[PDB]
Amino acid sequence: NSNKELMQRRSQAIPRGVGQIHPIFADRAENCRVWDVEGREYLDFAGGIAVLNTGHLHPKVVAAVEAQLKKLSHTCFQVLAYEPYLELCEIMNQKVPGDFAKKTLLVTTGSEAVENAVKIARAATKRSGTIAFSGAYHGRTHYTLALTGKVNPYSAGMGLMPGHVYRALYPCPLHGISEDDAIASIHRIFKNDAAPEDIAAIVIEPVQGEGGFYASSPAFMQRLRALCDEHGIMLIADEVQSGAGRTGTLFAMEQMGVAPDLTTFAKSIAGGFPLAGVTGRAEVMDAVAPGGLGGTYAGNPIACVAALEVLKVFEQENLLQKANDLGQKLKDGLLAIAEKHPEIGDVRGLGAMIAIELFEDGDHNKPDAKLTAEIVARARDKGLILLSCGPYYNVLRILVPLTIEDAQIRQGLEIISQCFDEAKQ
Amino acid sequence: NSNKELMQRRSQAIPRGVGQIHPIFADRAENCRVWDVEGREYLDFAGGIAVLNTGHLHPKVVAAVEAQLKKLSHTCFQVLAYEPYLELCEIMNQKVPGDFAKKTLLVTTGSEAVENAVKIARAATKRSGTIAFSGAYHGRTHYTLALTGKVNPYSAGMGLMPGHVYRALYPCPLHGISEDDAIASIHRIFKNDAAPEDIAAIVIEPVQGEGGFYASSPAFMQRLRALCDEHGIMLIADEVQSGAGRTGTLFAMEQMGVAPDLTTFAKSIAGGFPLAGVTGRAEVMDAVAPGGLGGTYAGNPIACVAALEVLKVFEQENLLQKANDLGQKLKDGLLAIAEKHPEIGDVRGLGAMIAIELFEDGDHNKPDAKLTAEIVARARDKGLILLSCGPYYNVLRILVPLTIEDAQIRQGLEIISQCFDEAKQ
Amino acid sequence: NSNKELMQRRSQAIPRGVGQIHPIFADRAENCRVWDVEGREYLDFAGGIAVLNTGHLHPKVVAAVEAQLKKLSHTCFQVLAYEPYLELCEIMNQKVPGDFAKKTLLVTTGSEAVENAVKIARAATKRSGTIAFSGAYHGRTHYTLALTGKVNPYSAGMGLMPGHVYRALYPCPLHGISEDDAIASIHRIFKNDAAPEDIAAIVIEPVQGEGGFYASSPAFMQRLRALCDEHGIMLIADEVQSGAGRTGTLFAMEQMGVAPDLTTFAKSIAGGFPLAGVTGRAEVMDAVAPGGLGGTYAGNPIACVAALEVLKVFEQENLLQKANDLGQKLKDGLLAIAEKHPEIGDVRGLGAMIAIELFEDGDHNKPDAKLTAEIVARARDKGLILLSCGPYYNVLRILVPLTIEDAQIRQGLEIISQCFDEAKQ
Amino acid sequence: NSNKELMQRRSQAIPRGVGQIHPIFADRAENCRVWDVEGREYLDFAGGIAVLNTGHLHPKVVAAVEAQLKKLSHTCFQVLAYEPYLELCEIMNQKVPGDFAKKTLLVTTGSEAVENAVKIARAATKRSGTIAFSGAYHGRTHYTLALTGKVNPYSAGMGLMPGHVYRALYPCPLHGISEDDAIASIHRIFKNDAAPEDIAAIVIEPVQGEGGFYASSPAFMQRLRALCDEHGIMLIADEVQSGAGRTGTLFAMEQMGVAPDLTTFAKSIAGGFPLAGVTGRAEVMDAVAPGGLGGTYAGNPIACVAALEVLKVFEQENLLQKANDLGQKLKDGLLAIAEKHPEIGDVRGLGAMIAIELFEDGDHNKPDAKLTAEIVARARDKGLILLSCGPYYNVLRILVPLTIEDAQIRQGLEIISQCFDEAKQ
Ligand SMILES: Cc1ncc(COP(=O)(O)O)c(CNOCC(=O)O)c1O
Ligand SMILES: Cc1ncc(COP(=O)(O)O)c(CNOCC(=O)O)c1O
Ligand SMILES: Cc1ncc(COP(=O)(O)O)c(CNOCC(=O)O)c1O
Numbered sequence A, B, C, D: 001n002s003n004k005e006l007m008q009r010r011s012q013a014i015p016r017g018v019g020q021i022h023p024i025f026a027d028r029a030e031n032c033r034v035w036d037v038e039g040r041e042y043l044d045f046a047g048g049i050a051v052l053n054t055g056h057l058h059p060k061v062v063a064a065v066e067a068q069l070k071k072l073s074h075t076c077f078q079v080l081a082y083e084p085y086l087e088l089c090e091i092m093n094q095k096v097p098g099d100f101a102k103k104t105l106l107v108t109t110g111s112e113a114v115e116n117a118v119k120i121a122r123a124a125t126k127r128s129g130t131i132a133f134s135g136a137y138h139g140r141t142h143y144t145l146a147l148t149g150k151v152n153p154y155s156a157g158m159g160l161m162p163g164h165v166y167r168a169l170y171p172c173p174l175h176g177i178s179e180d181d182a183i184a185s186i187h188r189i190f191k192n193d194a195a196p197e198d199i200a201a202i203v204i205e206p207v208q209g210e211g212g213f214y215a216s217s218p219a220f221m222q223r224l225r226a227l228c229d230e231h232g233i234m235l236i237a238d239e240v241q242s243g244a245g246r247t248g249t250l251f252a253m254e255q256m257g258v259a260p261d262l263t264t265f266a267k268s269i270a271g272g273f274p275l276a277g278v279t280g281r282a283e284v285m286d287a288v289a290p291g292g293l294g295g296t297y298a299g300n301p302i303a304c305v306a307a308l309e310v311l312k313v314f315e316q317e318n319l320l321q322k323a324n325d326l327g328q329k330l331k332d333g334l335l336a337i338a339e340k341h342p343e344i345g346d347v348r349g350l351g352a353m354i355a356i357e358l359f360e361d362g363d364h365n366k367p368d369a370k371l372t373a374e375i376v377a378r379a380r381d382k383g384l385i386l387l388s389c390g391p392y393y394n395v396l397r398i399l400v401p402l403t404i405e406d407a408q409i410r411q412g413l414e415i416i417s418q419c420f421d422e423a424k425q
């Protein structure tokens, strides 16, 4: 019943490989509030890593879950079907962008969704290679670790991950990688390592998550769509983190002016219950023969009803508009703090997928990982839970529930401001 | 709201790759009973594919879940920890066989569990290759599809799965593969394709599941343990399906007389909620550096409290003894039926992990997949839900909850008896 | 100028990885005679590892080489062509078995020939995987080491060789692998790891060379041809060692009753000059696009005229018949020796591809590698150069030139007899 | 006889995959002249693709070959050794740059040399990955095709080549890739796809050959050497084409100011006879265990004496100085032609490794492959044999023997000058 006592028990019972960002054991939570085992209250700006866009235990979501719990929790869909799985698939087919008919597969984790999107693209194109981008993050299974553009620590010490995954550059002007450089890096793969006829898919996060909250511009995404179209390559949009409304539209691709062939989703789709999925061009989804897709827990009944309710909540509570309003208030406030702290070299974000990036004395070539970690620690001491990201660990991101109250927005920005003021001296 | 209308909607919204064993939409369930959307009642001998050893919605499990729903459903353990994850790890470290210190990681699906056990073995041994057995089944991610000893349909049409996974023969006297043949096939790998110094682990199901309910003998497992010891190879016991009490002991390895270095578990561990994990020798588990293990939903709070309750139920309701008793009653009944049906060439199984195998005119080299499929269909028509398995699709398995009523044991065996009598008419 | 001083210099200038079977420096040679730097004369029963079926420096071969040396030694065929390359390709299209149009590519080494046959099959079938057999030997490049069914020492310590090469069992009744077992091991790969639709070729040595001089029966080869036909898979006959007349026919496949799609050849094709090549069904050979095949030294002019002359010598000197006569004389003498030494557990071979296998106390389960090495060393001391082979290093092979004189046959057999008698004193 | 008649026979007996740059069949050649079967005389500026630095059939080389031909042509060194192989290794150990003990392995082709250098690096570092550069060319075996930075046509239509080969950018200011971009691309691989501890070697051509005659600067090579040193990575200099004197020093690395760990050589090392090898840091070479290195024809006796004689000729005839003088005369002559032809956008090269690059309207972004091909064809009609190179096929390279006389230098430049004038007419 103390965080420290539980941390000691953790070190003796759980491998050190599972890191602990905050050495705190949560006991209960509601919307943006979390209480630890000692009764201390925190304001949650991490949202369980973008999983709680509708807040901890949204009452509508919980009541849907409680009703399903009276019916059944598991049959394994492939054995005996159930309606919540079917209804969610129909809804995702309508909401994921694309003017063609789509089909949806439900699985359980984001890594599984990416795994399956790739398998489907391979079966549909009869090709085996894939292309992913620098700083990308797609999961912790062997193949998704290969797709993830970061070896340490995700796959550190394990030897080489699966081959035949080629690396393109993610466009990022802030750090000198132009859209031209990014597209040229894909043609480079075609010419040097894997011809287009051997590439089943190009996988991309419309807004990189663990990679630093860097967004693709519609122009880049349009050139990418054209390049895939030219070569029969499937464009896979990994919206596990950017999806379920974080960017102000349900899916970030809606803001890109083009539709991907396959979209993966998870995290906030079910507001705190284990569910993930893949929605894409119906004929591409159907390339795999019966028995080729599935999973024991896939599309768990309770999680399906939670997701159907999350989508209803977005509509009833106009959370997309709130995401945009929230993002503006956050950026306005961070820009204000940036006026007094040159270390804040960039304030950015689509909708509520907001981040700031820190540099030693403002030099874009010197990521300040130290100040970043210090701000995360100081915030925690003030009762605010934050996460950093980026290949250089100098990006601070905000993933607070879209259901946050106005007073809490001011409260969080004030704490952050205090952390930077106090970090000096 | 008829099964037919829902199947039509399925064809429009969900990929055909997700097979539908039974064209039925379940509406609600309780213990061993499932009711479809039309109100028809069925006896569930599939148990959601060995996930419901405590039955659908065990009341104790559901009450614990309902209580946790008033606290929190998700924080992402590696961000903010919580006690149910910790407690379950402590208990698994004690319950998994091996008289030495252990640690446990929780993830969400069985495939993720196997993925992590291999990543851990690789980090621990500083080697990259793995060996798996003929007919094995380990999951649907790219790497676990490579480990899985069956291409069609699991990875059919997708091109070749990850390399550096080698194939040994699973011992099966019924089909002419002796234990010597099995051990020799491992040495063959060492000599022809991958030396011991490049093999991080040998992955094996103590009792193959999708592969036909073929169990390893203690003598064979002991020879394997010695072979791994000699070469510094990690022995990974995949107990995703054999575990959580199906064979009469919590883990089948308990009946082998030797302990693995790592064990995967999932399915019945949480009685119908998404949870999986890996428990192993502490020093092996600790080989991965911080940040190297994780997952967004991993050890979901609700699923953890469900697992803790499943473990108490096993103890309180004497479910291990019941598994053994149930298995004896099932085999006795199946043997009686076999006296009248030569096609049943084998009746086998540890605990309640029971199966019968069909051969044309009891000819061991002639797998009778048509009869097997006919029995499954005749059983559904009589209200009994069964699954077949085996590389040749001729094994009928029984995975009915261990909480089955005495009358239902009689009912299922009687229905199976009628199916064989009516198929022979 | 002494063998010992040259061996000391060798230890300082050349990697220990290049083994040295005999610590002798050859100075000159003629037909089956070799003289070292110390003037000692030896009888060559190794033939430079089956490279000298026409003997060291056959006078007709040397005369052709001398005539070509006056013209040119290299232009790179793909840059400026030359007639000897063209003429040899025309002849091999006719000589290689297969009653259909063929085309031929010339390269330089046997490993390059195998590499090319695989590249060609992959382009022809649009598939990436290959199957090779236990104990096979196909060369020392990364891919041919993967095809090679022996890790130690060929690829020992280098980490895992290229993936997507699967292992079947070579038929060998002497060691309990029946033809049914061999064919079943192929279906096992199709079911467990790589479907036929992903297998471009099955690569096989009609008579395994480094593997122990084990020969496929015509019945087995016919079943393999039927299996390949059914699945659109290319049958590649690696005749680098079995070819150029060693078995009594120019190519061993001629005795199998069926034709492969692709044949590799090297070693004795040019009687001691660097040349290798691939001959196959015309439509298969033409699947690779222009520029996809080549090599700097490929089809070297001097080696081409040497090969053209070697083929003429085979016709003029009736070497195919001599091979069969030599083989019988050798086997007869070896059988005579086996009557006094039970350790000789088998005497076998097609044509002049002769071997005996040694067992500790006639026990086929106890390969006698120590005695084998002892016989090689004793023979060397008596002036006879021999080589062993076999995955267990207990096979003595004879690859003496087909041009050997009758008295030398007796001389060699007598030496081997003395070696076994004295090893046993 | 006729070139066209021979081309027709070629189309019927040889696969189209073997391209034919010049549809001409050579009959005889001497120094820089070649005569076809129609008796027409050509000036050879291709040198059999840089194999004839000492010219066709240098008399001293031929005399050495003739002397060896009276002794023996093949024993397979690893069976029975011979002095020429030993003597050549001793000399290469001292002449390849590196102020430390080296050992040398001889094989037969350049692709085999690169294959072995990587196998040796892998065994020495106990790592399996490699890094190669954009536009690189290393051979036609599966693994060297993966190293080769060009898919079409070298590995076109065959599916994906071996994985675990990562791609860095070769520095080339002319085309916008700075040295900083190049080094940053190596760090990118380390961070995104393969940690340094999994990279056995970085393979680089000091001057890219098929990639366009682009040379590394000493500054870049020094940074690359420092990066390899920091991470324990072996630096492999592929000097198969740049070596044996082409650049003015025996090996190009000598001009870089640093030594590689391993160097591959072939082509001009033996003046037109099949030989290749790897010379490197002794303890790295010795990391492979006995039996782990070899090859049937490896270090062929005749090619060894040819190479020993080529090295003496370089000394006796001052060929390195001549290569520098030749290079200057060529560049001066080409610059004069460039004053009248804007299409020639760059004239470059170290020593006699000279090239010019053609651009449409002198625009660096508009490679002129059509004009380049027209020049090669016109030059041939005028009796001058040329080759092009470069990933965009717009680089004309000159590889004429270093033994060329002044009159022929003038004559070849005049022919080239005419081709450009007549191309614009
Ligand atoms: C774009 C994207 N795809 C895929 C995934 C993978 O989803 P899941 O964690 O549900 O497997 C994630 C998960 N972020 O998780 C972080 C961590 O574990 O350090 C993600 O952001
Ligand atoms: C031993 C074993 N390991 C691992 C797994 C994989 O576990 P999970 O389904 O939770 O990923 C399974 C799952 N069986 O799944 C059947 C199917 O989808 O056809 C399994 O039996
Ligand atoms: C059937 C076969 N294929 C292919 C090859 C490879 O041919 P090459 O050595 O010309 O590359 C060989 C070579 N045997 O060489 C033995 C050794 O080096 O220990 C062979 O026997």
Ligand SMILES: Cc1ncc(COP(=O)(O)O)c(CNOCC(=O)O)c1O
Binding pocket: C294, C295, C296, C297, D049, D109, D110, D111, D112, D114, D137, D138, D139, D140, D205, D209, D210, D238, D239, D240, D241, D242, D266, D267, D276
């Ligand atoms: C740097 C380098 N390494 C390695 C090699 C390979 O050497 P080899 O051709 O002797 O195998 C080459 C050969 N270039 O040959 C051209 C072609 O066949 O199109 C090369 O240039």
